[PDB]
Amino acid sequence: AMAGVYTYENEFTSDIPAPKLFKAFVLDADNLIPKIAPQAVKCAEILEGDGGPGTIKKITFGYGYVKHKIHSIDKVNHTYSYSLIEGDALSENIEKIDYETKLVSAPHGGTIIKTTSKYHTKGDVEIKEEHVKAGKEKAAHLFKLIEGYLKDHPSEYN
């Protein structure tokens, strides 16, 4: 019954400018990711809301699905936050996970992507280093694919 929050932060870099990355990775993820990784995302459907705060999305992938609830989108600052509210990473021990991502402009025109994950826990906390790392290496593979797409279609997301 003990409720708590485990917070984990991570950061990676890109040569892609922040605005373009924001438009592609963040704002057009429903459309872009199916294109470059049909297994990571087959389908995204909005179940309620506009597409801004409060929006609920169902994401189906090549098998199972998750639901995301959008908390905020700050287009001007290039920050985004949303929670995993249904899916297999959840349990009686992890009731939900909040993500917050910030795209910061690097010195030479690229980006530093900073992500905070907050696991809302119940009872004893058990969180394996190996599952956290497997999550980062999966995301990084898919991020590298997005970067490749943006470099292969330079007239997009300007």
Write structural notes for this entry:
By secondary structure, this protein is of the alpha+beta class. The protein has a single domain, classed as START domain (Alpha-D-Glucose-1,6-Bisphosphate, Chain A, domain 4), CATH 3.30.530.20. 27% of the residues lie in helices and 42% in strands. It contains 3 helices and 7 strands. A 7-stranded antiparallel sheet has the order 1-7-6-5-4-3-2. β2 and β3 (56-61) form a beta hairpin. α1 (18-27) packs across α2 (29-36). It is globular, with a radius of gyration of 16 Å. This is Major strawberry allergen Fra a 1-E. GO terms for molecular function: abscisic acid binding; flavonoid binding; protein phosphatase inhibitor activity; signaling receptor activity. It comes from Fragaria ananassa (Strawberry). Pfam families: Bet_v_1.
In short:
This protein has about 160 residues and is an alpha+beta fold.
